[PDB]
Amino acid sequence: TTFTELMQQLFLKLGLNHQVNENDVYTFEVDGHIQVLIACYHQQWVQLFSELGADLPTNDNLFGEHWPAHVQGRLDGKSILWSQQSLVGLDIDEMQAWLERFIDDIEQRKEPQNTKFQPN
Amino acid sequence: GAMGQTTFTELMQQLFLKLGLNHQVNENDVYTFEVDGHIQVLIACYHQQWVQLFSELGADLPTNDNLFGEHWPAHVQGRLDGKSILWSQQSLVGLDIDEMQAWLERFIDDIEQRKE
Numbered sequence: 544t545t546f547t548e549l550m551q552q553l554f555l556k557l558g559l560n561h562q563v564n565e566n567d568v569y570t571f572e573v574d575g576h577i578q579v580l581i582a583c584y585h586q587q588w589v590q591l592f593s594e595l596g597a598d599l600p601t602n603d604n605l606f607g608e609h610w611p612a613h614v615q616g617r618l619d620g621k622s623i624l625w626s627q628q629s630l631v632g633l634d635i636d637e638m639q640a641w642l643e644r645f646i647d648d649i650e651q652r653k654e655p656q657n658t659k660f661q662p663n
Numbered sequence: 664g665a666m667g668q669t670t671f672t673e674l675m676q677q678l679f680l681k682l683g684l685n686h687q688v689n690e691n692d693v694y695t696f697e698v699d700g701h702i703q704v705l706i707a708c709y710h711q712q713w714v715q716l717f718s719e720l721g722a723d724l725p726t727n728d729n730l731f732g733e734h735w736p737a738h739v740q741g742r743l744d745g746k747s748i749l750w751s752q753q754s755l756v757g758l759d760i761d762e763m764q765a766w767l768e769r770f771i772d773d774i775e776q777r778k779e
Contacts, residue, residue, distance in 0.1 A: 588735050604729055604741045606715055606750055614739055617728040625731050631757030 544630070546583035552635045553642070577649055579642065589630050591642065593649050595622040600661045611641075613648050624649055667711030670755055674714070675706065677760040678767070702774055704767065713752050716767070718774050720747040736766070738773050749774055 550569050554561060561571040569581045580592045595615070599622040602615040611628045626645050651657060675694050679686040687695045694706045705717045720740070724747035727740040736753045751770050 604739055610713055614729055616730045629754045
């Protein structure tokens with residue numbers, strides 16, 4: 544209801560611009576080091592994605608730490624973080640809290656404290 | 664709240680009927696069911712809002728890259744207690760019996776492949 548309508552509100556609330564291609568993928572930069580991409584698949588599945596870079600420790604990838612979960616995947620020899628949920632009943636307050644949780648998690652995983660050694 | 668949790672219970676009641684299949688529920692409201700006596704899927708709800716499937720994969724498996732896009736919602740391979748598990752979740756809201764049933768079949772089919 545509908546993905547576009549939701550993204551349009553989202554940007555407003557966060558005061559960001561920001562790019563969207565003819566492919567309906569939305570981009571926004573955070574402090575110019577983080578970039579999150581958002582898209583909707585099958586008219587239902589809202590999908591977040593961000594690159595984390597090289598040399599991240601592995602994550603066990605369990606559910607229960609964030610709702611919805613943030614999963615650490617491997618793409619092209621580097622680590623990424625992604626998260627998805629159904630658009631049905633997703634509102635602006637929740638979309639925003641979610642992107643905020645996602646962004647905070649990316650930030651912490653990129654900090655030196657999250658060392659390859661594990662930490663450790 | 665109470666209504667969301669009742670919605671989860673309602674869906675489980677529908678699913679077990681549709682599956683015409685023995686369910687167990689424990690004290691924590693975890694539903695279980697075996698398929699052909701070696702595959703066991705557990706279903707629980709969190710915060711009256713999220714349906715979570717879980718299955719043990721039974722070995723410490725070849726890592727999956729854990730990307731999204733292959734199933735909706737994704738099936739994720741986690742590591743728990745030194746072994747691999749498969750899991751998948753989605754919001755309870757707007758989830759009906761036919762989607763629930765299809766999701767469960769996709770998830771079981773994937774577990775089968777990964778145990779092979």
